[PDB]
Design a protein around this ligand. Structure first.
Ligand code: AGS
Ligand code: MG
Length: 163
DNA sequence: GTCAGTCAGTCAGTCAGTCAGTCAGTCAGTCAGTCAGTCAGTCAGTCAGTCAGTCAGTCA
């Protein structure tokens, strides 16, 4: 039809979804809307992993394209941290130092709100055995079997990546 | 005892068979003379910790 449509993805309800495609074509649109939809339902905060640190200095305008989705309530960023009507929205950090984070309490998670997990022809960015790095990330955002649902999202379809 | 001979040994003659030098393709051998990926240094650039400069939340 018109845009990226996560309805079937949300429907078939894997505890861990895995979608690919639509480079910039809303593959991030609906999935950045969804955490704020959980916030309007008043659920839990989300976790935003980043590939590296400079990628963080410019990305504070993460809610610009979801206002036209939900003009109603307040969706802003105070700085590094995201605030919806002033309540904490996203725990936003690149990869380098998640270990120092992993002793902190992380009681509230809603959904995986990152994409371009893996870039085509890009392994200089990569970290050795980062598949187990995502394992540490998930177990340090797990408290039970609930509150979490994950997605992968690569720009294109390949059959060579280790995952 | 002459005329001089007319059917076997005899020697003038081969006559196809014979040995083995002598070049000879040729033989893969081979070993060595040519040549094609292999790595080390150095060139440009990616990480994630510094400096250390600065608009600004709690106060004079
Ligand atoms: N529900 C929607 N309403 C309007 N536009 C949408 C919708 N879903 C997707 N889009 C389109 O998606 C675009 C932005 O999507 P993105 O968030 O960039 O997706 P993306 O594929 O992650 O690209 P990047 O690399 O993350 S910026 C918009 O400009 C629209 O063209
Ligand atoms: Mg995206």
């Amino acid at each position: 039809s018109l845009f990226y449509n996560p309805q079937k993805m949300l429907s078939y309800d894997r505890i861990l979804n895995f979608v690919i495609g639509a480079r910039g074509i809303g593959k991030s649109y609906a999935m950045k809307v969804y955490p704020i939809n959980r916030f309007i339902k008043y659920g839990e905060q989300f976790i935003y992993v980043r590939r590296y640190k400079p990628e963080l200095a410019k990305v504070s305008n993460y809610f610009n394209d979801v206002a036209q989705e939900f003009p109603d309530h307040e969706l802003v960023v105070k700085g590094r941290r995201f605030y919806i009507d002033g309540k904490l929205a996203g725990w936003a950090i690149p990869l380098s130092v998640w270990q120092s984070e992993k002793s902190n309490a992380y009681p509230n998670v809603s959904t995986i709100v990152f994409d371009e997990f893996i870039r085509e022809k890009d392994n200089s960015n990569y970290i050795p055995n980062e598949v187990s790095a995502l394992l540490n990330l998930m177990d340090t955002v797990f408290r039970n079997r609930e509150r979490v649902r994950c997605i992968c999202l690569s720009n294109a379809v390949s059959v060579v990546n280790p995952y």
